[PDB]
Each structure stands twice: as structure tokens, then as C-alpha cells.
Coordinates of C-alpha atoms in Angstrom, one line a residue:
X91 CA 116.9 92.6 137.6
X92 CA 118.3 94.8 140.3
X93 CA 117.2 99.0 139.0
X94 CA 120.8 100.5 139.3
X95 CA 121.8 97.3 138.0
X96 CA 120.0 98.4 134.7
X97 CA 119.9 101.7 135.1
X98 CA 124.1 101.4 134.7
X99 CA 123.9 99.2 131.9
X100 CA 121.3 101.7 130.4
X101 CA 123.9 104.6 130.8
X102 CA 126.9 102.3 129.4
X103 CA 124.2 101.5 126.1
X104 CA 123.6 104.9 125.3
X105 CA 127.2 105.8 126.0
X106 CA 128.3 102.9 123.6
X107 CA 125.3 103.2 121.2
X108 CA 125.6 107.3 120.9
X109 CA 122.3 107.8 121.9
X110 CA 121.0 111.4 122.4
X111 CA 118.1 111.5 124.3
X112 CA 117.5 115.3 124.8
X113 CA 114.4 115.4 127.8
X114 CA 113.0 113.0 130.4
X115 CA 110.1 112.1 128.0
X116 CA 112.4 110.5 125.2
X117 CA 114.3 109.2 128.1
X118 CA 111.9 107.2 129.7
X119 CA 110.4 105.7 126.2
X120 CA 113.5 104.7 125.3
X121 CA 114.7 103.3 128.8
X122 CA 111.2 101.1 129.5
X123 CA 112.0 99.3 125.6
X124 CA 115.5 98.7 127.0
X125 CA 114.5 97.2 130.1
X126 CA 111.7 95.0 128.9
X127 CA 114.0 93.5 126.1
X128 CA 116.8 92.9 129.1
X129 CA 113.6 90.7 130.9
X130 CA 112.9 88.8 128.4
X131 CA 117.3 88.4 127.7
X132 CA 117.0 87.2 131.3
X133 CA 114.6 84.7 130.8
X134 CA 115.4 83.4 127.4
X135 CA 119.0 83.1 128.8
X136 CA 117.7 81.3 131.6
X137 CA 116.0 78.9 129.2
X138 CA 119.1 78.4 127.0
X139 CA 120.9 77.2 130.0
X140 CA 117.9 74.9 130.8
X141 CA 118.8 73.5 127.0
X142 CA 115.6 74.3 126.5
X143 CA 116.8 76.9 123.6
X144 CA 119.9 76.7 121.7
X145 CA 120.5 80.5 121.5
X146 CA 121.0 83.4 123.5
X147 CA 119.8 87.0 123.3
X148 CA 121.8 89.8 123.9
X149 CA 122.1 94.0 124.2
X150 CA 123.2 95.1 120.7
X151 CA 122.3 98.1 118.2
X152 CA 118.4 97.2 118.4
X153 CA 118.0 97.0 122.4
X154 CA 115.9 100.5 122.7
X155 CA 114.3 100.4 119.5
X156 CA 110.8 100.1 118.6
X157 CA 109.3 97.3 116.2
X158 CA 109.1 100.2 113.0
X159 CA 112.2 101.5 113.8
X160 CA 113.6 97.9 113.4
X161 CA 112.0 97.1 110.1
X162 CA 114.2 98.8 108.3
X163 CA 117.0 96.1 109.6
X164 CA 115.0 93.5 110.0
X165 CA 112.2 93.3 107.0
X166 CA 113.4 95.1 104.3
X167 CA 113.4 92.7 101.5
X168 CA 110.8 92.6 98.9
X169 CA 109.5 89.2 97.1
X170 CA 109.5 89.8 92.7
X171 CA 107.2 88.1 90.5
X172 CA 109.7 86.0 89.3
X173 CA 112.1 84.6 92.2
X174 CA 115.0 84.0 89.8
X175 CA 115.3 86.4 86.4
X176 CA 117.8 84.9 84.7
X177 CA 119.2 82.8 86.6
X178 CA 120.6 79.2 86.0
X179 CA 119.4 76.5 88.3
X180 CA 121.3 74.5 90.1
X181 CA 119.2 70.9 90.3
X182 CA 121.8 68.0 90.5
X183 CA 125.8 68.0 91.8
X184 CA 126.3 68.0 88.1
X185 CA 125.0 71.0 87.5
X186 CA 127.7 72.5 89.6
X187 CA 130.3 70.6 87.4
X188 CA 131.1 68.4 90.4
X189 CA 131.9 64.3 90.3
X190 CA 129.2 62.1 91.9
X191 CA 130.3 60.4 95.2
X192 CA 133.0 62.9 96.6
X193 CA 132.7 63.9 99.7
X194 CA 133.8 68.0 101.0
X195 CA 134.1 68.6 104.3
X196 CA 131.5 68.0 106.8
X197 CA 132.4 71.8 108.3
X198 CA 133.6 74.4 107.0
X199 CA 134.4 78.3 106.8
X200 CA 135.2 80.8 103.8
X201 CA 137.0 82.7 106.6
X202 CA 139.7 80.0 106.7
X203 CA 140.8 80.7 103.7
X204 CA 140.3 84.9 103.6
X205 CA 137.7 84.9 101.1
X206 CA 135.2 86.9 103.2
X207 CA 135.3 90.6 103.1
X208 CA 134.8 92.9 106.6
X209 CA 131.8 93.3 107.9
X210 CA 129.3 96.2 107.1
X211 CA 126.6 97.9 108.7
X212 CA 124.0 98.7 106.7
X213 CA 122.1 101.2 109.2
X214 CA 118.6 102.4 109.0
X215 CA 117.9 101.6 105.2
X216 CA 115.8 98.5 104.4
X217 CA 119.0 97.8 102.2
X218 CA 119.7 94.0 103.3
X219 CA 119.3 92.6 99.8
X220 CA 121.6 95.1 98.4
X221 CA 124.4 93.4 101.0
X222 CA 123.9 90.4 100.5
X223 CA 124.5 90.8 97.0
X224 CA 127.8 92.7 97.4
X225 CA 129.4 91.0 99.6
X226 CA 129.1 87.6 97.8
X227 CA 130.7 89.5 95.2
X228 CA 133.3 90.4 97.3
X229 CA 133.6 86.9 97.8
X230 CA 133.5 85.5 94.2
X231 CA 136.6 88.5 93.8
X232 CA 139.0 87.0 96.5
X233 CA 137.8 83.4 95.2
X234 CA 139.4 84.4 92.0
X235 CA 142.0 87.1 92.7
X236 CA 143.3 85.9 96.3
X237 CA 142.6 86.8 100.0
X238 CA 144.6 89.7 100.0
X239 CA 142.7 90.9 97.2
X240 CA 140.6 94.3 98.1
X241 CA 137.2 93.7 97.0
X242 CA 134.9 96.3 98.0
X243 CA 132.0 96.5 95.8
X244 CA 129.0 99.7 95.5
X245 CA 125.7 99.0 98.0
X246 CA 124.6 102.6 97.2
X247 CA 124.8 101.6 92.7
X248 CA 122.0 98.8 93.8
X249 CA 120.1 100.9 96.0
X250 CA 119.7 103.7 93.0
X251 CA 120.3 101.8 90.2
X252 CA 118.7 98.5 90.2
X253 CA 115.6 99.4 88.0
X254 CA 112.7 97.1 89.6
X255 CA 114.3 97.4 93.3
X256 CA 112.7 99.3 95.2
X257 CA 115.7 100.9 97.2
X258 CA 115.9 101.4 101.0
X259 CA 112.2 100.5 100.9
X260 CA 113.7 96.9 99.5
X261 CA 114.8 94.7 97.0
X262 CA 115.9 91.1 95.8
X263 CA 119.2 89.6 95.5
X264 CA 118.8 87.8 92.1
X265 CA 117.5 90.9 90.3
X266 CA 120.5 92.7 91.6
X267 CA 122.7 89.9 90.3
X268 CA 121.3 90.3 86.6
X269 CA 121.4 94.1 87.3
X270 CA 125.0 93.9 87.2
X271 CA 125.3 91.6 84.4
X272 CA 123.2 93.7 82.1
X273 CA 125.4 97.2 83.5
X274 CA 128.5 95.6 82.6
X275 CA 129.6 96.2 86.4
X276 CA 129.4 97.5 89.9
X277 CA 131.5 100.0 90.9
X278 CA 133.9 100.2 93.8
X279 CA 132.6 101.1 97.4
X280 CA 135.3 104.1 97.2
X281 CA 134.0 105.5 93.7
X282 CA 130.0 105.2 94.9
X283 CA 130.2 105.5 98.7
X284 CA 126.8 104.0 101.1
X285 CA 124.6 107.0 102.1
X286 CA 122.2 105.1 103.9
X287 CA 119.4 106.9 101.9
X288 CA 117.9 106.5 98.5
X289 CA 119.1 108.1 95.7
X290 CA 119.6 108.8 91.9
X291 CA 122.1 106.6 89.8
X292 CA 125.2 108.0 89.2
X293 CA 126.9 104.8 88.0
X294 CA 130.5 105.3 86.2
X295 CA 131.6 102.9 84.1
X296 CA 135.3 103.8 84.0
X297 CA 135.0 103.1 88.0
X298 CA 134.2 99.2 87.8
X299 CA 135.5 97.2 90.6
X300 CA 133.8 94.0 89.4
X301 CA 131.9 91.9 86.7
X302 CA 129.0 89.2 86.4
X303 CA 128.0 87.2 83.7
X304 CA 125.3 86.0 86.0
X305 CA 124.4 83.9 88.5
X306 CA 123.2 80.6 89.6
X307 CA 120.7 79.3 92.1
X308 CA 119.7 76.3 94.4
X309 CA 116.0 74.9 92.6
X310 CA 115.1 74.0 95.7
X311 CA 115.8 73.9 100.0
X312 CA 118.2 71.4 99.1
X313 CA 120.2 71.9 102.3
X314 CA 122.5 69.0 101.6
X315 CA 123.4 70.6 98.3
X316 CA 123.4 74.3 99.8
X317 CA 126.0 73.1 101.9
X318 CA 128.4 71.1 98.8
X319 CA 127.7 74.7 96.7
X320 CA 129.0 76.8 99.5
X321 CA 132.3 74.9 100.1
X322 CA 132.7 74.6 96.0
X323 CA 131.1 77.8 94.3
X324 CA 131.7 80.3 97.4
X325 CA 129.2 82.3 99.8
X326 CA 125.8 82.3 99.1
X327 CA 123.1 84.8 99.1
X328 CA 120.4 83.5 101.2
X329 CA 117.2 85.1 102.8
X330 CA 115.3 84.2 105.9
X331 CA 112.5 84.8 108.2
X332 CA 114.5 87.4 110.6
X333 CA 110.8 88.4 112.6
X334 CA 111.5 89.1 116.4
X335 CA 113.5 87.9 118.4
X336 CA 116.5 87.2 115.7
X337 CA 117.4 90.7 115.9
X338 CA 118.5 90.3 119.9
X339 CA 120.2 87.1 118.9
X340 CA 123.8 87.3 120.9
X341 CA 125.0 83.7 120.2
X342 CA 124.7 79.6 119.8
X343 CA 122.9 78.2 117.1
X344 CA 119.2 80.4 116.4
X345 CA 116.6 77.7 116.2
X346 CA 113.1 79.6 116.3
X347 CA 110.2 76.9 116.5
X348 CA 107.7 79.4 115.4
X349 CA 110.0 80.2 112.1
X350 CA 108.4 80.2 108.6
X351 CA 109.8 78.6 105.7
X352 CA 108.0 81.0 103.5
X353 CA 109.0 84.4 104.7
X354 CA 111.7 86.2 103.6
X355 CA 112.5 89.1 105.3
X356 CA 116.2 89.2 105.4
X357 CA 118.8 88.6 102.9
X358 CA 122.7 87.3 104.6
X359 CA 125.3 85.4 103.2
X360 CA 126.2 81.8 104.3
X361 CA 129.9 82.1 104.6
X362 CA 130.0 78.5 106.4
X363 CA 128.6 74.9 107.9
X364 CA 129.5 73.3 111.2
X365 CA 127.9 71.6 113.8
X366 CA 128.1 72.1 117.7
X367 CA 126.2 71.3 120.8
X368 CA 124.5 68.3 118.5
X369 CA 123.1 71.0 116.5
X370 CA 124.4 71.4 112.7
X371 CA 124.4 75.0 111.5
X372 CA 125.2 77.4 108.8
X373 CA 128.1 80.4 109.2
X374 CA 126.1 83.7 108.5
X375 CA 127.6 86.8 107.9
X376 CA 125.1 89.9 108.5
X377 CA 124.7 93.3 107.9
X378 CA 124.2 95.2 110.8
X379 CA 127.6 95.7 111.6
X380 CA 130.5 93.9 113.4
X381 CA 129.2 94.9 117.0
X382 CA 126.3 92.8 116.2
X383 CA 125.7 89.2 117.1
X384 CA 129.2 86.9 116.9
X385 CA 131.2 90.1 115.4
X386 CA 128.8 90.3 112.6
X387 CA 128.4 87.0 112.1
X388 CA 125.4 84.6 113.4
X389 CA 124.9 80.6 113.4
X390 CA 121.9 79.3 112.6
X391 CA 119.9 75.5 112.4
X392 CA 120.9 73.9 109.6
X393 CA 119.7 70.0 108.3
X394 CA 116.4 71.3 110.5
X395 CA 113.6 71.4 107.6
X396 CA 115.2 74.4 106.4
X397 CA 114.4 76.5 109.2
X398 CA 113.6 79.9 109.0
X399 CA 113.2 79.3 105.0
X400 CA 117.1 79.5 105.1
X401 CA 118.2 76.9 101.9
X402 CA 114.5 78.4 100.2
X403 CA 116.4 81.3 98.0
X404 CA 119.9 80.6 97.8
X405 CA 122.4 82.0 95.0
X406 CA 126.0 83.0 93.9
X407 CA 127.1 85.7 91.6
X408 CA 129.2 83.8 88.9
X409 CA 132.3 86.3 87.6

């Protein structure tokens, strides 16, 4: 790539991004990460048009940022004992109180019908599995109360109250599911605003913005079954194997041959299904705010041996 070429797009990224970079030194760390990573854009891109990758890579939040400054994002989630305290397993259709032999959709998108709420950035606090929990209460809220209903539920009430997370050093979806069962709610985003730190519980209980009496979960990378539980029950919390170079992911369908089905790293929501470019996917909706990916939102394999481990820890709050 030309050097002025970059060395404008490096002035419009740290015009966009806010970046202060106070001497030369700083400056030309920062300026050699964001030049490799636009290389290897290049020639990823360049493969993608080849078809011989079904994604591209793109300049976001994470284009000058170093591997440990990226963890936080990235590889935040922590693994429990036991995968699924409390929780009721979903095995069969039948289990989700659904008739054998209909048929939903073969695509589909919670956004359609309003029932996802905004996207939110969860910034540098390994946080992800507190998101992913709230925001498919959000969803379970406008499922029963309507699209227009404002559902905006307390990240920060996970991150200091969830007794065996382990805050912005990380956390598990299912644990904060029975946390909230067990409070007797979650407060509102307004009452118990995100401070992208750790801190002490403060939880009110007159400031409740939502309930659970649970929550169920997929037995096993049923991916068939992940998708029938989306378009019936609502988004689902998943987790995934988000190592390098998901984080630079811009847009198509993220298909990483190298993926493990066994790492979990980062915990989403699966808002949707489709299919495009003879590639089915799932609809993601992420946490690192709406300038990220497909305004917030990614796509990635689906009916591919659950790639990336994405049907291996799938759940949904139950109101």
C-alpha cells in the first residue's frame, strides 16, 4: 500500500477513533500495528475475492491495538465447573413445547420483528458474558411486552454482583442467568449505569427492570435445533472461539478453518439464521459497539460442524 495512502487513512483512524498519541515514540508503535493489520486486510481481502475466504477484514476499534490490549474484548470469558447451574436442558423439540414435523422458517431475523435492543459497547472490560446475558433479556422483555417496549437491563449489577463471576476479569452467561433468578431481578441500565470497571454491588431492588425464573439450554451443538429455538424461544446466548483475526472481521460470513469447537472466549447473542453466497449462517449481535463489524452485528458459518464452537453453549433467559 501506497505510504501517504496509509499515512491518511492513519490520520482519519485516530481522528475517528479519538486516539491521543502524545510523542513520536507512541506514534510510531501505534502506526506500524496499524499498518501491518492494513497488509494483511489487503491480502485477506484479496483472498475473499479469490473465494478463497468467505469474509473480509476491516479497520474498526481494534486496528492499532496490541494482542493484551485486545483480550479484554476478545477473551474475556471464563469456563465454571459446571457449564449449566440450574439450568433446564433442552434435548428434543418437545422439550421446547413444540409439535413434531412443523417447519419455521429457513431464515430468519429477531430484528424483523423489533425484538432486539441497540447495540452496546462494552469497552475495555473483559465483560462480554455480562452482555450477552443482558441483552437476551432485553430480548425476552420486547418478546413479551412489544418492540416498542424499552428494555434496558444492568451490565454493571453482573459485573459486581454475580457472586462466582469473576467481573471484568470474566464470567459465564448461565451463572449470570441463575444470578438473577436467585436476586429476584436486574436492575435498569438507567438505575445501575456501565462503568467499564469492576466494582462493589449496589443492587436496588425497588429499581428492577426485569425478572427470571431461569433459563434453559441447548444439551448439545444441535445446530438444527439452535436454529428452531431461536425463531421460537428468542435470542440466544452463545460463546465462541473469537482468537485473531475475528476481531478485524468487516463483513460476509466468518468461516475460520483453524477455529476450535472447544474454546470459548466470547459470549454474543444469535439474533438470526440465513444463508448467502451458498454459505448458511447465524445473525450475531456483538458487543463492541455499533461501529464494529456490520453495525454491531456479524455473520457467521452455521450447519459447518459448529464452527468456532458456536451451537456448543447456547441458552435463553426464560421470564
Amino acid at each position: 500500500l501506497p505510504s501517504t495512502f496509509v499515512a491518511e487513512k492513519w490520520e482519519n483512524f485516530k481522528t475517528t477513533y479519538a486516539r491521543s498519541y502524545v510523542n513520536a515514540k507512541e506514534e510510531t508503535f501505534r502506526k506500524q500495528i496499524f499498518q501491518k493489520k492494513l497488509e494483511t486486510f489487503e491480502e485477506h481481502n484479496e483472498k475473499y475475492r479469490q473465494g478463497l475466504v468467505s469474509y473480509t477484514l476491516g479497520v474498526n476499534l481494534f486496528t492499532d491495538m496490541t494482542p493484551e490490549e485486545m483480550k479484554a474484548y476478545t477473551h474475556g470469558l471464563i469456563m465454571p465447573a459446571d457449564l449449566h447451574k440450574n439450568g433446564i436442558p433442552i434435548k428434543t423439540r418437545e422439550d421446547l413445547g413444540l409439535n413434531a414435523s412443523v417447519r419455521y422458517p429457513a431464515s430468519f431475523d429477531w430484528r424483523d420483528q423489533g425484538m432486539v435492543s441497540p447495540v452496546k459497547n462494552q469497552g475495555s472490560c473483559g465483560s462480554s458474558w455480562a452482555f450477552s446475558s443482558t441483552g437476551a433479556i432485553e430480548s425476552q422483555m420486547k418478546i413479551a411486552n412489544g418492540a416498542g417496549y424499552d428494555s434496558s437491563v444492568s451490565e454493571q449489577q453482573l459485573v459486581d454482583c454475580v457472586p462466582n463471576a469473576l467481573g471484568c476479569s470474566g464470567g459465564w452467561m448461565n451463572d449470570a442467568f441463575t444470578y438473577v433468578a436467585q436476586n429476584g431481578g436486574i436492575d435498569s441500565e438507567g438505575a445501575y449505569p456501565y462503568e467499564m470497571a469492576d466494582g462493589n454491588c449496589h443492587y436496588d431492588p425497588n429499581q428492577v427492570a426485569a425478572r427470571l425464573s431461569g433459563y434453559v439450554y441447548l444439551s448439545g451443538p444441535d445446530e438444527n435445533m439452535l436454529a428452531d429455538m431461536v425463531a421460537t424461544k428468542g435470542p440466544v446466548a452463545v460463546a465462541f472461539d473469537a482468537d485473531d483475526p475475528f476481531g478485524s472481521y468487516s463483513g460476509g460470513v466468518y468461516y475460520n478453518p483453524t477455529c476450535e469447537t472447544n474454546k470459548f472466549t466470547h459470549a454474543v447473542l444469535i439474533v438470526g439464521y440465513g444463508n448467502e453466497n451458498g454459505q448458511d449462517y447465524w445473525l450475531v449481535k456483538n458487543s463492541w459497539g455499533d461501529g464494529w463489524g456490520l453495525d454491531g452485528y456479524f455473520k457467521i458459518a452455521r450447519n459447518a460442524n459448529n464452527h468456532c464452537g458456536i451451537a456448543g453453549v447456547a441458552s435463553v433467559p426464560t421470564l
